[PDB]
């Protein structure tokens, strides 16, 4: 899928997307989601 193998994607039921990077070990509401559409 359009997800990079280094990236980890989940969306919260609140309607917010947070990608956890196993690289840096951080969660990202700062998403390729809003960065796209």
């Amino acid at each position: 899928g359009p997800l990079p193998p280094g990236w980890e994607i989940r969306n919260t039921a609140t309607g917010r997307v947070y990608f956890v990077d196993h690289n840096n070990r951080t969660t990202q509401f700062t998403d390729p989601r809003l960065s796209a559409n």
């Binding site: 980890e8 989940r10 919260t12 039921a13 609140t14 917010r16 947070y18 956890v20 196993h22 070990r25 951080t26 969660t27 990202q28 509401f29 700062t30």
Partner: peptide, 15 residues
């Protein structure tokens, strides 16, 4: 993050 404080870093956070 410009959005509200996100889920604590668990690999697969259940929400």
């Amino acid at each position: 993050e410009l959005e509200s404080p996100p889920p604590p870093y668990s690999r697969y956070p259940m929400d």
